[PDB]
Motif scaffolding. Structure first.
Motif, PDB file in Angstrom:
ATOM      1  N   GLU A   1       6.005 -17.558  24.155  1.00  0.00           N
ATOM      2  CA  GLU A   1       6.503 -16.170  24.292  1.00  0.00           C
ATOM      3  C   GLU A   1       6.674 -15.240  23.638  1.00  0.00           C
ATOM      4  N   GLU A   2       7.168 -15.170  22.545  1.00  0.00           N
ATOM      5  CA  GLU A   2       7.442 -15.140  21.495  1.00  0.00           C
ATOM      6  C   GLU A   2       6.772 -15.078  20.356  1.00  0.00           C
ATOM      7  N   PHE A   3       5.913 -14.834  19.744  1.00  0.00           N
ATOM      8  CA  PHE A   3       5.185 -14.870  18.437  1.00  0.00           C
ATOM      9  C   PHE A   3       5.868 -15.177  17.079  1.00  0.00           C
ATOM     10  N   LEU A   4       6.880 -13.698  17.330  1.00  0.00           N
ATOM     11  CA  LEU A   4       8.102 -13.472  16.046  1.00  0.00           C
ATOM     12  C   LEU A   4       8.874 -12.618  16.431  1.00  0.00           C
ATOM     13  N   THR A   5      10.450 -13.236  16.071  1.00  0.00           N
ATOM     14  CA  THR A   5      11.932 -12.864  16.318  1.00  0.00           C
ATOM     15  C   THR A   5      11.958 -11.853  16.128  1.00  0.00           C
ATOM     16  N   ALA A   6      13.318 -11.188  16.449  1.00  0.00           N
ATOM     17  CA  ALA A   6      13.363  -9.524  16.557  1.00  0.00           C
ATOM     18  C   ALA A   6      14.005  -9.311  15.165  1.00  0.00           C
ATOM     19  N   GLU A   7      14.337 -10.306  14.036  1.00  0.00           N
ATOM     20  CA  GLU A   7      14.698 -10.039  12.505  1.00  0.00           C
ATOM     21  C   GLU A   7      13.034  -9.536  11.851  1.00  0.00           C
ATOM     22  N   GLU A   8      11.913 -10.406  12.387  1.00  0.00           N
ATOM     23  CA  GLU A   8      10.891 -10.927  12.462  1.00  0.00           C
ATOM     24  C   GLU A   8       9.773  -9.576  11.912  1.00  0.00           C
ATOM     25  N   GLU A   9      10.238  -9.529  13.424  1.00  0.00           N
ATOM     26  CA  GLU A   9       9.862  -8.096  14.191  1.00  0.00           C
ATOM     27  C   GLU A   9       9.540  -6.725  12.786  1.00  0.00           C
ATOM     28  N   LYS A  10      11.777  -6.479  12.761  1.00  0.00           N
ATOM     29  CA  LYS A  10      12.249  -5.154  12.364  1.00  0.00           C
ATOM     30  C   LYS A  10      11.791  -5.155  11.085  1.00  0.00           C
ATOM     31  N   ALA A  11      11.156  -6.017   9.951  1.00  0.00           N
ATOM     32  CA  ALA A  11      10.944  -6.359   9.424  1.00  0.00           C
ATOM     33  C   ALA A  11       9.473  -6.215   8.725  1.00  0.00           C
ATOM     34  N   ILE A  12       9.126  -6.481   9.491  1.00  0.00           N
ATOM     35  CA  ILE A  12       7.274  -5.550   9.403  1.00  0.00           C
ATOM     36  C   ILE A  12       7.151  -4.317  10.108  1.00  0.00           C
ATOM     37  N   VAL A  13       8.285  -3.657  11.366  1.00  0.00           N
ATOM     38  CA  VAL A  13       8.525  -2.454  11.171  1.00  0.00           C
ATOM     39  C   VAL A  13       8.837  -1.834  10.152  1.00  0.00           C
ATOM     40  N   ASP A  14       9.804  -2.538   9.819  1.00  0.00           N
ATOM     41  CA  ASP A  14       9.799  -1.859   8.573  1.00  0.00           C
ATOM     42  C   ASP A  14       8.706  -1.462   7.162  1.00  0.00           C
ATOM     43  N   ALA A  15       7.974  -2.446   7.269  1.00  0.00           N
ATOM     44  CA  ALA A  15       6.758  -2.433   6.248  1.00  0.00           C
ATOM     45  C   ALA A  15       6.191  -1.527   6.072  1.00  0.00           C
ATOM     46  N   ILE A  16       5.805  -0.714   7.590  1.00  0.00           N
ATOM     47  CA  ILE A  16       4.495   1.067   8.071  1.00  0.00           C
ATOM     48  C   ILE A  16       5.576   1.966   7.940  1.00  0.00           C
ATOM     49  N   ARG A  17       6.588   1.651   7.424  1.00  0.00           N
ATOM     50  CA  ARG A  17       7.993   2.971   7.726  1.00  0.00           C
ATOM     51  C   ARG A  17       7.936   3.229   5.738  1.00  0.00           C
ATOM     52  N   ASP A  18       7.176   2.852   5.489  1.00  0.00           N
ATOM     53  CA  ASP A  18       7.753   2.953   3.513  1.00  0.00           C
ATOM     54  C   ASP A  18       5.698   3.193   3.626  1.00  0.00           C
ATOM     55  N   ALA A  19       5.833   2.921   4.471  1.00  0.00           N
ATOM     56  CA  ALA A  19       3.922   3.244   3.872  1.00  0.00           C
ATOM     57  C   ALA A  19       3.122   5.031   4.714  1.00  0.00           C
ATOM     58  N   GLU A  20       3.839   5.334   5.725  1.00  0.00           N
ATOM     59  CA  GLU A  20       3.791   6.757   6.103  1.00  0.00           C
ATOM     60  C   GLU A  20       4.176   7.450   4.542  1.00  0.00           C
ATOM     61  N   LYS A  21       5.422   7.137   3.924  1.00  0.00           N
ATOM     62  CA  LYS A  21       6.429   7.805   3.080  1.00  0.00           C
ATOM     63  C   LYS A  21       5.215   8.063   1.580  1.00  0.00           C
ATOM     64  N   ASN A  22       4.109   7.098   1.618  1.00  0.00           N
ATOM     65  CA  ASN A  22       3.783   7.462   0.419  1.00  0.00           C
ATOM     66  C   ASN A  22       1.682   7.255   0.711  1.00  0.00           C
ATOM     67  N   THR A  23       1.170   7.909   2.231  1.00  0.00           N
ATOM     68  CA  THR A  23      -0.169   8.095   2.427  1.00  0.00           C
ATOM     69  C   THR A  23      -0.009   8.842   2.980  1.00  0.00           C
ATOM     70  N   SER A  24      -0.873   9.630   3.519  1.00  0.00           N
ATOM     71  CA  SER A  24      -0.873  10.739   4.788  1.00  0.00           C
ATOM     72  C   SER A  24      -1.068   9.922   6.097  1.00  0.00           C
ATOM     73  N   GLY A  25      -1.937   8.570   6.143  1.00  0.00           N
ATOM     74  CA  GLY A  25      -2.502   7.952   7.029  1.00  0.00           C
ATOM     75  C   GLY A  25      -2.313   6.977   6.808  1.00  0.00           C
ATOM     76  N   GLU A  26      -2.746   5.975   8.369  1.00  0.00           N
ATOM     77  CA  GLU A  26      -1.570   5.706   9.448  1.00  0.00           C
ATOM     78  C   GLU A  26      -1.817   4.126  10.191  1.00  0.00           C
ATOM     79  N   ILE A  27      -1.260   3.358   9.707  1.00  0.00           N
ATOM     80  CA  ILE A  27      -1.130   1.586   9.758  1.00  0.00           C
ATOM     81  C   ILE A  27      -0.479   0.685  10.994  1.00  0.00           C
TER      82      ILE A  27
END
Length: 145
Positions: free
Chosen positions: A5-31
């Motif tokens: 039902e859930e490919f990743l746990t809330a711990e795993e999902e949070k840690a990948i969502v945070d990995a995108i949040r830092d990339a937006e602060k390094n380049t004006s393009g979207e992932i």
């Protein structure tokens, strides 16, 4: 793993969502990532339909990516908007593919996506270096089928 039902746990999902949040602060393009089971048609044409249906061309620079992942076949497709494709090459994209491929080949979907986002952000920052006035056009929220 055992829970389908859930490919990743809330711990795993949070840690990948945070990995995108830092990339937006390094380049004006979207992932963006889209996770789904399996397809009735071709994954390339489906990813092009899903990208356009989700309205991801709604950027000022035409530089959003969607990562379509099919968890049943264990495969991944990567598709960028025209402002990426027109400014980079397949040699630039080879790095992104190899980073993800090697980790999907180990079986760790999180690590392969996170490292691919990281390497993409550093590579894209060469073509689009970060600006103090830079603007956040997409959200970090994971997409699902």
């Amino acid at each position: 793993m055992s829970k389908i039902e859930e490919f990743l746990t809330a711990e795993e999902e949070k840690a990948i969502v945070d990995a995108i949040r830092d990339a937006e602060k390094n380049t004006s393009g979207e992932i963006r990532v889209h996770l789904e089971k399996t397809s009735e048609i071709d994954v390339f044409d489906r990813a092009m339909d899903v990208f356009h249906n989700l309205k991801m061309d709604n950027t000022k620079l035409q530089n959003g990516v969607l990562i379509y992942v099919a968890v049943e076949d264990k495969t991944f497709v990567i598709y960028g908007d025209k402002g990426i494709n027109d400014v980079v090459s397949d040699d630039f994209w080879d790095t992104t593919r190899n980073a993800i491929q090697l980790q999907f080949k180990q079986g760790n979907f999180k690590q392969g996506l996170v490292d691919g986002i990281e390497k993409a952000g550093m590579a894209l920052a060469k073509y689009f270096p970060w600006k103090k006035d830079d603007i956040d056009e997409l959200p970090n929220t994971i997409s699902k089928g």
